Amino acid sequence: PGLEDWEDEFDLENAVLFEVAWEVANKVGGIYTVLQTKAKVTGDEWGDNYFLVGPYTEQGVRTQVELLEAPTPALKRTLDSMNSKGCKVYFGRWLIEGGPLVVLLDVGASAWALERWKGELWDTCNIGVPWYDREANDAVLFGFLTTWFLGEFLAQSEEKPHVVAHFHEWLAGVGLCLCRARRLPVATIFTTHATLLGRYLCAGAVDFYNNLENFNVDKEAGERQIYHRYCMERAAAHCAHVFTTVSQITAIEAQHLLKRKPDIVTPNGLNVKKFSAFQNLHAQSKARIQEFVRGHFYGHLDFNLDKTLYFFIAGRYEFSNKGADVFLEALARLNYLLRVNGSEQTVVAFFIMPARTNNFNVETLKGQAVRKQLWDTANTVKEKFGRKLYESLLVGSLPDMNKMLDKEDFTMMKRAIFATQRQSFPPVCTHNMLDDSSDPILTTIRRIGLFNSSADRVKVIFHPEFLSSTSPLLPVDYEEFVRGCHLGVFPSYYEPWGYTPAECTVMGIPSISTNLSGFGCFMEEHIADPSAYGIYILDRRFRSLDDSCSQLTSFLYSFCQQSRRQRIIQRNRTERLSDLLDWKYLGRYYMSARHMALSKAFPEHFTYEPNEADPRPASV
Amino acid sequence: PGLEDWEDEFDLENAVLFEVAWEVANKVGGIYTVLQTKAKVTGDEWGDNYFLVGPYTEQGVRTQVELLEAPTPALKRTLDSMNSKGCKVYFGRWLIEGGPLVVLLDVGASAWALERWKGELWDTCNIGVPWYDREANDAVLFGFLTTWFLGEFLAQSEEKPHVVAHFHEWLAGVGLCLCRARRLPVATIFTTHATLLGRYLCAGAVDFYNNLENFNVDKEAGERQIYHRYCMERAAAHCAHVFTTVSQITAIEAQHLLKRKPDIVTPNGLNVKKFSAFQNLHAQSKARIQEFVRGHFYGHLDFNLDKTLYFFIAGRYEFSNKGADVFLEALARLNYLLRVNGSEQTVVAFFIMPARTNNFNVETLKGQAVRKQLWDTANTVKEKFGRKLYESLLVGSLPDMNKMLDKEDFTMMKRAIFATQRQSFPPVCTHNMLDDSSDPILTTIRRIGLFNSSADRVKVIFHPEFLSSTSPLLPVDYEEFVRGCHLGVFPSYYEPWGYTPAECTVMGIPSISTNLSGFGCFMEEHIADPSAYGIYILDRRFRSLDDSCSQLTSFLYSFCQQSRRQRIIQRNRTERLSDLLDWKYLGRYYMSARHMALSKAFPEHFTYEPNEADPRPASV
Amino acid sequence: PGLEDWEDEFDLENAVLFEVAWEVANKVGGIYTVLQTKAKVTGDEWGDNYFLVGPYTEQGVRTQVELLEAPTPALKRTLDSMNSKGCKVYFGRWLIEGGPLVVLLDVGASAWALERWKGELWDTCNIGVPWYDREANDAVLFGFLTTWFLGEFLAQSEEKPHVVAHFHEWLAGVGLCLCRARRLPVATIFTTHATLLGRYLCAGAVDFYNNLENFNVDKEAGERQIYHRYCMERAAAHCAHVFTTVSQITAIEAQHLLKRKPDIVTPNGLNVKKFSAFQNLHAQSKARIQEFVRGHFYGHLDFNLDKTLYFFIAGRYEFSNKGADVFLEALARLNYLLRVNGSEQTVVAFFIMPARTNNFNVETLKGQAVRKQLWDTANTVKEKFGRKLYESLLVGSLPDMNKMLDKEDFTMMKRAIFATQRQSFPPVCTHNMLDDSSDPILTTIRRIGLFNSSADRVKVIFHPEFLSSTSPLLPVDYEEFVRGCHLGVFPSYYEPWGYTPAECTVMGIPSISTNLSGFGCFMEEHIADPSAYGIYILDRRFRSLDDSCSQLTSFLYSFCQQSRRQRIIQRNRTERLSDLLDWKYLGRYYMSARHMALSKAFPEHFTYEPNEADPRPASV
Ligand SMILES: O=P(O)(O)OC[C@@H]1O[C@@H](O)[C@H](O)[C@H](O)[C@H]1O
Ligand SMILES: O=P(O)(O)OC[C@@H]1O[C@@H](O)[C@H](O)[C@H](O)[C@H]1O
Ligand SMILES: O=P(O)(O)OC[C@@H]1O[C@@H](O)[C@H](O)[C@H](O)[C@H]1O
């Protein structure tokens, strides 16, 4: 389909690009995966002219960085001068899929120059940094060393090439500000993945999404003592040849907060080849989740397991940001509706959110051991029955069915039966809370009244611990378990881009998101009639909370009323949707951003035609 | 234990050895495996001075010979002269385990010189060859080219090394005779694996083993028109520095026929590493043979399969040489004895001997299909029963055993039951004979009256076709099937060395042989109280036929009366016996023969001390 | 969806139905499976009032019939009188999925009455039967005993119920003619699956489908001496309360040949549950077919196997009826087109048609053995390499890649390499023809020039033998092999209904049929835009041969030009199409036919409203 070499035929000649980011070869956040995935295609387009600028960490260099010698004499002399001037910079490869060249800068080896660098920064842009941040000083040092390295590289080259600088986050924006300050012949691109004040204002302040035009950012930066971070972020955003954002919602957020409309939007992608390794895997995962729910619900298995649906929500433990309260309230409403209608369907909800636990509870382990004992007894009895039937059937005689069970088989069956006796109800959580009184999820469940009762048609399972293949009760990784679920509900409120819903959708599981996330807006914009492809968008921007909850309840009820053939068709449609989120297509927006940057920086040599051409209308 | 480098520390210096044999890189007989196994250790001792002399075949060079360039200039010039004088000789490697150097001589490229070579051979030793043999002419040509190559190699070498020639069979004895005729400074070793007149005299003539001293070999060579072959064989045997045989029985045969006592006996060995890849394999093979006998004996399975013993005899279709008649008569006697004693044991006899068949019979395929259908029906019913039991047992209720079978399960069971109806008796052979009237095995079975009747305690299975893993009814190779059998009975009359009993014993299966084979004599001489190690020797030399049969019957009855613990102990003892038949130990006799040859050829440089030192007394 | 109990709510009361057919409990033709599949649902609707009338065979009663006692006294007395009057009739169950009640009539026990029955038949309808048919006499006897049994059952019942007779083929039409002759109060349904003269006229006569209105059936029945069979068939068709056919093409055939328009069309169905046991199975089958083609094409594997397509045609060996010549000519044309366009795609054609063979050819077995040896060598080397890499990697050292291969590994690789040497071309057929000179398929292949050459882009594989799981080279059943193929092409000319294309389509494999078959017309009528669902209809009725061939070539070329995503979507669409051909829906037409029959026979008690209501418009 649409490859990188479609329509951007451009004279690249002697051009070098720097992918400056604070997290390269240092796993801190989530856009680490974005850089790791984009590196392969970007380097394939760029050949050997792709560099990454980032801080040095002993752990990172020990685990995934292989030190090497730089291939050009210019890098040799620049590194020699850089080490001989009182700093410490190393060179090597990044041990990832693409294997790009990396320069690592040790911010701890330049503490002597912070006093003069702060003064120069103030004399250049009137930016001050308090002494107690311990993070902004690191950003300032990283920017100073980055701009000094760029200046030395351009100055010491016999022939000056076209250098492109690309920064990603406000810990690196000081470098962009400084390189623009010193009038270096460089093309600067600034891309933001999350507004700094967005996270601060969403928590505490109410109706942050209904008051964008009524926010005078200066004060809100003032009272939180994050004024200087916003100052450098906004300054770096302003003095950029091309300004870029990751999603539309963040685009409006930056426009109303950073006071600059982003020129191009660049969604985050991923490599679909590794995830693709498609119904056998889902069937196996569903069967083994059936095994798990049989283990947990021993002694209360009064509902058909062929008409049960599995819902799940995952991510970091943010009750409000992920909208778990909305999901819980809508689950209660759906339980009420199903109980009224007398339906045979059952909904089992999973909640994978980290919490502060110590060990498992006795009930879950007891149930799992009981299930294992029942399975073993059934296997032993069925093996004995099969052997007896085979031997009695070779002699051409009908099996006398009343004599295939003897004393010890009855003893084992009886032991199993008394093992499956229970008077209480299955627990709603599989661990022991250390803050059970202050837990919001459990408090909400208690308020809405879901205790896995016999009459309840909706079951709630809370699994705080990270999902691992070595777990005593769920020895499975995140990917395989997600593959088997029926639907993923993410009623998020504030999220610049949804990594988890993207992973769910690329997997081929129908998902529910909001118009309030980058993924939701991307899907809504790039396809028509999204409901047919297994994606349901919750309108949260132009609606109240009760409206958002009723709509989500209606979506869930509509999903629960679908027949098996309808679910199969919807699942096939969502299967044939993974290629929209791969870097093979999403990498073109970054390339267009680069072309804009070169056109702005060197209009004499480069000229760009503003082509914004780039699709899935319908299937029924 | 005993390695090659134990006690033969000898100054080898510049010595070259030629392993002349007609079959090298050309699979014809059985000692091909002997050479292939001995090559690795002999070359390891000899370094790069190990050569093989043999005829050229297009198929052999295409399948397992890689042509190469000879590593020494002497070989270069000898090959160049050899090709330039009117012959055609190539050089290369043998694609086997050891990878030894091979020289291949094309006997079809020297038909021009046969007229003069026959005259020279007659003028040298008065040996004539008739024109209609088509095999002795090839031997004469091979010997002439071999001796000419040796003479050219020794003559054209700047420094003359100590050359050792080793021949193996009368197709190569002409070379030994010629090299001794031309007084070449070579050490000649002649080893025979089978006397030529032994096979001719065993068939037809009676009591060949009771009249060795009353045989005037000249006439018996005369009437059969094999006089010249015996002449060259005996002449080559006489004019050898060291005369060697493969087994003791062949030693006496050569002494009373070739009129020369062999100096050293060299038994054939094999590499035990590949065979060793030890009760799991036997259990699996026994279970699958149980599956086969269940398939064959459908509708007549009235005997316990936990008390059944499996006997087998294999090899080429020689009724008298392998003594199958003795085995059949003794099986009839044992059936009579077991029927009298009212024992619950059952003996199933296998006969793996190639015959002239066309296809399988209908009965065996029908039985196998019936068994497969029964197995499939049992598996389906047992799966359904297990699933129903599991679901009914999760709810903590005892299985109502009278409702786990429904209409279609009863239908399938009934269909199987009417499928297992048979009025006739199982066939004694699994194929269709083209000479059923003239078959000796079937005639003997009919005479002794074993038709697999219900009252019969001994079952006979005849499997003419080669045992292959792709067979429709026995998809198994020889090794795995032999691993699972209980006992291997080989009442051989004439066999210089037993490859099949050796393979059976190295495998770890108790076996019965005779004092009339090389393997039997070897085992009897090298261990004390052989009965405890799972080997039973039948005394056939000093006894009549009726005596040999009664002794074999007694041996079989004693084996059948053993308990399970006794069988386990005997099997472990026979397991710990494989290292006696490996080239790691059996290769020392060849090395001693080489030392004798060098001592005889060049007494000035070499002197040997006649050490004949080389053990398993008992275990209960 | 649409079940049997949708809209036909009707007072059935005391009604009995007889499913008269000559093949019940006697496997002869193909509609045996139709009856076996329809029995379950028909008996479920009918309770215990479903009977089958058919001849007695010892083999059938021994293998799949369980004799039982009839549950009603009326059947007791009728059977007693029937046996006491000089005939021999038994009672029992049919050992099939539904388990319906069966009455079996021995036609060989009533040879005494044929003389009077022939005279009575002639005096009733002037129908004569020649003495040398040996099949029409059996039909006459079956009809006489059937009508006598029906008359005795209705006469001897204390209260007379509403009896329904259903016949299926002209071997049973005599019964319908006789019951209509004797004015029994019975509802008669006649259904034909194939016109008798259709098969006779398609062979020999030209343009049978362009001359229906110009055929005066009397003569063509006359010259072939099949006049009396057509006479009884047409007479039975005329004197039927309801006339039924299996397909539209047969409907027009009966209208223009039997001179009676069929009231209702009843397509044949099947149970989709057993076939459904869906991409994992196809992937496994495709991989193993890749294994097979690797084995067959050793030494000529110069084409990519990831861009190869597998076509297949199967059925009985009818060159003209199945249109194999058209397929071969179009394959040649497509090979020409692909060779011109320089495409990388390759087409491998399979031909599963029984022939008169004796054994396999040497080349195929040699290739399979070579492939097995290569696979074994690769596995051994890869295991050794993995073990060495693991051990050398535990010590934290990079693998010295130049030392992981030693002498014996190189020897094995070399042996494999010389094993894969071949000078000739792969054979077009895997067996040895006994009539290679007179074989039409091979003659056509030779004429069109497809010898599996290197430059050829289309490969032809002919597999005459029945496909079995025990085959030496293709140990697979029909179902699993068909599951893995890419497309099934059936350019049939004369076929009343396509069992093989129906099995292919219900499996989920895109298929090509003609408007000239029952399946093709059914699909064309019941869906709109058939090309989107993976079915391509060849217009053969209104077109010449060259037109039919060009259209098929265009269809194949269009299929070959599809991308992988297009193929996946088409395959999912054809997956979601199996429920159209199940008896859960196709069984309603038979039920409507029954209601028509009861309305015609007893208008006083029953009245039917002519509802002909019964759908898949499109997806893209
Ligand atoms: O999760 P479900 O709604 O039960 O669907 C799971 C379905 O099970 C089986 O019918 C097949 O494996 C289908 O391929 C799969 O889609
Ligand atoms: O524990 P070890 O001394 O290594 O002995 C373990 C031996 O390994 C292999 O040789 C065989 O499986 C033996 O049956 C087993 O006894
Ligand atoms: O036969 P093909 O055109 O190669 O399609 C086979 C395809 O292979 C893999 O991509 C998947 O298993 C698909 O589910 C399957 O459809």
Residue numbers in the entry:
A (entry chain D), B (entry chain A), C (entry chain B): 13 to 289, 293 to 629, 637 to 642
How do the authors describe this structure?
Glycogen synthase (GYS1) is the central enzyme in muscle glycogen biosynthesis. GYS1 activity is inhibited by phosphorylation of its amino (N) and carboxyl (C) termini, which is relieved by allosteric activation of glucose-6-phosphate (Glc6P). We present cryo-EM structures at 3.0–4.0 Å resolution of phosphorylated human GYS1, in complex with a minimal interacting region of glycogenin, in the inhibited, activated and catalytically competent states. Each GYS1 monomer consisted of two Rossmann domains and a tetramerization domain and interacted with GYG1 in a 1:1 ratio.
While processing the GYS1–GYG1ΔCD + Glc6P data set, we observed that one three-dimensional (3D) class appeared similar to the inhibited (T) state and was refined to 4.0 Å resolution. Similar to our T state map, where phosphorylated Ser641 of the C terminus interacted with the arginine clusters, density for Glc6P in the allosteric site was apparent for this structure. Unlike the activated (R) state, Glc6P in this structure did not interact with subunits across the dimeric interface, because residues 290–292 remained disordered. In this ‘inhibited-like’ state, all interactions involved the phosphate group and were identical to the activated states except for Arg586, which was not in a productive conformation to interact with both glucose and phosphate moieties of Glc6P. However, 3D variability analysis of the Glc6P-bound inhibited-like state showed a unique movement not observed in the inhibited state without Glc6P. This appeared as a 2.0 Å expansion of the complex from the tetrameric interface; by flexibly fitting our inhibited-state model, we observed that helix α13 moved towards the regulatory helices. However, the R state is in a dynamic equilibrium with an inhibited-like state, owing to competition between the locking interactions of phosphorylated termini at the subunit interface and the conformational change due to Glc6P binding.
